[PDB]
């Protein structure tokens, strides 16, 4: 349309056309807006658009247009400044300075266009980063001078200085070379005395709130880096902690300044400093008490009301109090005259800890952890805080979150455990009283009984066994009566669940009271027939949890019993689990396997195992007899689900028994692999008859579940096996014969990535014992899986991940399998590794970089032999250049550290002459040229063509440094990051690469 006229640079820029495009983008909508956006982007991305910025800034009446003009200038200053003719550099500086002065002088502009002025200030700062001080030594003196002649200019100079400090000290690490960052830090540090003088004069004398606030905002930045003497040898702490805490305009920024002050580097042997540190805290707390709110105030309610900036203020007060007290509270702990201050500060924190705000609670909770840990270890401190700790007990107990929010529960548990050790009597009393108000109904609610139950469970192990015993009794007695008293399964379910939760948290109590433990389990078994939502899950979860902690008491014969209780559980398992869902049945069997593995008499353990598996083994025999006599059954979804659940039961028990599971595995192994084959050909037949869409059908998904569960069973056992001779001689060969060809000869959409995962475990555990088997694995999965994943980075995501895990372990444990590869296949292996480099997916990328590193090491270990020499001739520079590519292309930042490690190993091979042949071709350099010289030459040429805007000097200095530093990973990395900065601009200083030296 018409709007595209600004894109035609052969004409003069119609400024009114620019403003129309900008208005349509910012204030317009829909299709119009979108067109304008695409035009504006094309405009500012024109490499000549900066030439028209001085027009826009002079003659536009639209502040958005000028903002975009400054963005265009920013790109130029940041990337191409040093390529400009020097006259344009001076011209751009002068234009930007003048524009800022003029905007400051017009009070209407100064108040109405803060966004445009802030952008101009930032553009100025970009110029300073290029020009100052070496080409602009007077900037700071003239800034200080101009500040005195105008409040607006002075205020704006505080913004400029704030941004300069941010750009030099807070955001330089990843955007400048090490040398340039140091140069600017030293330059600011050299002239900060004069800057501070202006800043302190403004704070002492000024009356313009807006100027004061800007000065304090810049002070906040300075506190990140300035020497402590500017804070402690001036009166600035007094001003911060009194004058500026009184007006709310300055209060927010001042508090943030004082928080950073609480983090300055200060000598800890100076008594004057210590009193100053006490004093500014005392002043601040006094101002809060008299100007904001007293310590008794309900901060929970204030925060909830969310008036004005109250929420940010209370957040900032929490940060101030916790930061200062974590560092300095010892200063307040010995002087009786500071005791009130110490406790008032902590009382504010108590009140802050009642606010309903998860992230703020975590901030205060981290501090409480710091406090109560110190009271637990440090002599003569806990009595000071007795009343604070008592209140904290109630706060934590009442805000306990669900354990089974994982991180927050663990932090709360930790604090409460400390608080229990500090005063066990007070903790018990609070919890009992709390339980009474659940019974009297005054604080009764589903939520409230739950949180109290979690709190009670969380302190298990802190009381003596005698005190624990009558505490647990009291709690359960009260909880039982509470459940009696309520009506409806809703309430009774909630309370019975909490009872089982508490019980499960006190295994020490269960192990000492067998009859009670028996009653619990039998009650859980009862609850496994209760269909009210949640009860059965709760029952099974509590069962396995109690078992994990008390298994020994199920496997011995307890006095007054006829048999170990595990026998009684097994005898009645059919009725016990009759009403459970399969997933819950498997948990039950897993719990039984935990117990059975505690039996170390082998004949008894194996009898228990075969008895436990009686029902699945009989179902199994039946289906094996049937399904073998009629493969059609396997299309009956009912038979498929039965089969899968049998195998899942075996997985569950094998999970808890590991090596002990072997006898049960032997009962089913050979027929299970025959079932694998029968299901496999059923899947293939369906895909033949119906197409690829068959893999989505329930029938085939069910069949593949069987295959996956069989593989998971074998993986689970082999990962835990202790007799590896049996693994190799009995399990592996039937396994490979059953799974490898089926995988290779299925179409891609029918191959189970789980095959790769299972093979990864085989190689891990016994790879060293089956070299021919590893070769067979590679032959059957390597090329066909690679072809699935080497066309994009997205298809077959699970095969992708498992593929590189398998290659990684093969490269670790049976590298000889890659040696036997025919040369065309070894080349595919190298391509596969580099392909992995180029993934953004961390799973693949990390393994790809590690395989590369491990491979180099494997080759190095071979010594000076033909395969190793051919490897370097064929692939050394491929690995060097592919590593450099992902290091420098800005799309693989997540792998920087491992790319650098790989690159460093590669370069060090050459500079230790661990490569025994020339890396160059016959007549490419004189006879006798060292690989060192050739490597430098190859890299110089590579970087020159890849980054043509670098000077030869830049490249040569970078490579000289990188080469010298190839034993020092930290420094090597610094030099790589310096190179990544320099390739983003023109004219980088080649002496930057001498920084480490």
């Amino acid at each position: 349309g018409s709007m595209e006229g600004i894109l035609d640079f052969s004409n003069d820029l119609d400024i009114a056309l620019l403003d129309q495009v900008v208005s349509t983008f910012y204030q317009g909508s829909g299709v119009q807006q979108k067109q304008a956006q695409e035009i504006l982007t094309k405009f500012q991305d024109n490499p000549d658009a900066w030439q028209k910025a001085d027009q826009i800034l002079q003659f536009s009446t639209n502040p958005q247009s000028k903002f975009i003009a400054l963005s265009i200038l920013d790109k130029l200053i940041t990337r191409k400044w040093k390529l400009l003719p020097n006259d344009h550099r001076i011209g751009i500086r002068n234009f930007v300075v003048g524009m800022i002065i003029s905007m400051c002088q017009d009070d209407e502009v100064f108040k109405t266009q803060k966004n445009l002025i802030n952008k101009s200030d930032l553009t100025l700062v970009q110029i300073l980063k290029q020009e100052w001080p070496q080409n602009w030594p007077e900037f700071i003196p003239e800034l200080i001078g101009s500040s005195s002649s105008s409040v607006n200019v002075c205020e704006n100079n505080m913004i400029v200085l704030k941004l300069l400090s941010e750009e030099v000290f807070d955001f330089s690490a990843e955007q400048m070379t090490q040398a340039k960052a140091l140069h600017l830090k030293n330059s600011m540090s050299k002239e900060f005395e004069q800057i501070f003088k202006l800043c302190f004069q403004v704070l002492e004398q000024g009356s313009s709130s807006s100027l004061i606030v800007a000065t304090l905002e810049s002070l906040l930045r300075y506190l990140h880096w300035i020497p402590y003497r500017y804070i402690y040898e001036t009166n600035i702490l007094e001003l911060l902690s009194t004058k500026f805490m009184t007006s709310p305009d300055t209060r927010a920024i001042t508090l943030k300044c004082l928080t950073e002050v609480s983090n300055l580097k200060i000598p800890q042997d100076n008594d004057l400093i210590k009193r100053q540190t006490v004093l500014f805290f005392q002043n601040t707390l006094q101002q809060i008490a008299t100007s904001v709110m007293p310590v008794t105030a309900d901060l929970k309610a204030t925060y909830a009301n969310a008036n004005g900036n109250d929420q940010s203020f209370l957040q900032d007060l929490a940060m101030f109090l916790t930061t200062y007290l974590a560092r300095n509270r010892a200063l307040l702990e010995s002087d009786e005259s500071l005791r009130e201050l110490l406790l008032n500060a902590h009382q504010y924190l108590i009140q802050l800890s009642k606010i309903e705000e998860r992230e703020l609670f975590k901030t205060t909770l981290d501090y409480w952890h710091n406090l109560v840990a110190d009271l637990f270890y440090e002599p003569l401190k806990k009595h000071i805080y007795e009343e604070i700790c008592s209140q904290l007990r109630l706060v934590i107990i009442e805000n306990m979150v669900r354990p089974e929010t994982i991180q927050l529960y663990k932090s709360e548990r930790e604090v409460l455990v400390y608080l229990t050790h500090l005063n066990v009597i007070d903790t018990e009393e609070i919890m009992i009283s709390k339980l009474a108000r659940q019974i009297d109904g005054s604080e009764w609610s589903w939520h409230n009984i739950n949180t109290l139950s979690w709190a009670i469970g969380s302190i298990s192990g802190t009381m003596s066994e005698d005190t624990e015993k009558r505490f647990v009794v009291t709690v359960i007695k009260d909880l039982l009566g509470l459940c009696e008293q309520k009506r409806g399964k809703d309430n009774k379910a909630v309370v019975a669940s909490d009872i089982m939760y508490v019980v499960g948290q006190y295994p020490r109590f269960l192990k000492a009271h067998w009859n009670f433990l028996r009653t619990v389990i039998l009650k859980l078994f009862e609850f496994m027939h209760e269909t009210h939502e949640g009860v059965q899950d709760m029952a099974c979860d509590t069962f396995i949890k109690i078992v994990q902690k008390c298994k020994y008491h199920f496997v011995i014969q307890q006095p007054r019993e006829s048999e170990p209780f595990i026998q009684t559980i097994i005898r009645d398992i059919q009725k016990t689990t009759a009403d459970l869902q399969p997933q819950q049945v498997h948990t039950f069997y897993k719990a039984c396997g935990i117990i059975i593995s505690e039996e170390r008499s082998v004949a008894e353990r194996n009898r228990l195992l075969s008895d436990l598996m009686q029902l699945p083994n009989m179902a199994w025999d039946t289906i094996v007899e049937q399904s073998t006599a009629n493969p059609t059954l396997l299309l009956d979804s009912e038979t498929v689900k039965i089969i899968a659940n049998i195998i899942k039961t075996n997985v569950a028990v094998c999970t808890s028994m590991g090596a002990d599971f072997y006898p049960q595995l032997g009962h089913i192994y050979y027929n299970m692999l025959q079932l694998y084959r029968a299901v496999s050909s059923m899947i293939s037949a369906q895909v033949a008859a119906e197409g690829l869409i068959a893999t989505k059908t329930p029938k085939v998904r069910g069949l593949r579940t069987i295959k996956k569960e069989i593989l998971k069973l074998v993986e689970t056992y082999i990962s835990k096996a202790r007799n590896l001779d049996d693994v190799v001689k009995v399990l592996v060969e039937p396994l490979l014969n059953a799974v490898l060809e089926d995988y290779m000869n299925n179409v891609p959409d029918a191959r189970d990535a789980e095959v790769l995962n299972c093979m990864t475990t085989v190689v891990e555990k016994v790879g060293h014992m089956i070299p021919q088997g590893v070769i067979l694995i590679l032959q059957s999965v390597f090329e066909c899986t690679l072809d699935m994943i080497n066309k994009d980075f997205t298809e077959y995501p699970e095969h992708r991940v498992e593929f590189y895990k398998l290659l990684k372990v093969i490269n670790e444990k049976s590298f000889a399998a890659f040696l036997e590869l025919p040369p065309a296949a070894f080349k595919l292996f190298v391509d596969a590794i580099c392909w992995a480099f180029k993934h953004n997916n961390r799973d693949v990328e990390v393994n790809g970089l590690q395989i590369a590193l491990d491979l180099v090491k494997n080759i190095e270990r071979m010594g000076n032999v033909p395969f190793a020499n051919e490897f370097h001739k064929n692939y050394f520079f491929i690995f060097v250049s592919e590593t450099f590519f992902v290091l420098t292309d800005s799309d693989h930042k997540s792998g920087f550290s491992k790319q650098a490690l790989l690159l460093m190993k590669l370069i060090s091979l050459v500079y230790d002459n661990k490569i025994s042949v020339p890396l160059y071709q016959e007549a490419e350099v004189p006879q006798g040229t060292s690989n060192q010289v050739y490597l430098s030459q190859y890299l110089a040429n590579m970087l020159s063509n890849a980054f043509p805007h670098l000077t030869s000097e830049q490249i040569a200095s970078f490579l000289s440094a990188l080469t010298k530093q190839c034993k020092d990973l930290v420094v090597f990395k610094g030099t790589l990051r310096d190179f990544l900065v320099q390739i983003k601009e023109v004219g980088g200083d080649p002496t930057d690469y001498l920084f480490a030296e």
């Binding site: 009794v473 039982l480 459940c483 009872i499 039998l522 009650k523």
Partner: peptide
């Protein structure tokens, strides 16, 4: 402990 009548717990 045996005084606790947990076997009576009902839903």
């Amino acid at each position: 402990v045996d005084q606790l009548r947990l076997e009576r717990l009902q839903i």
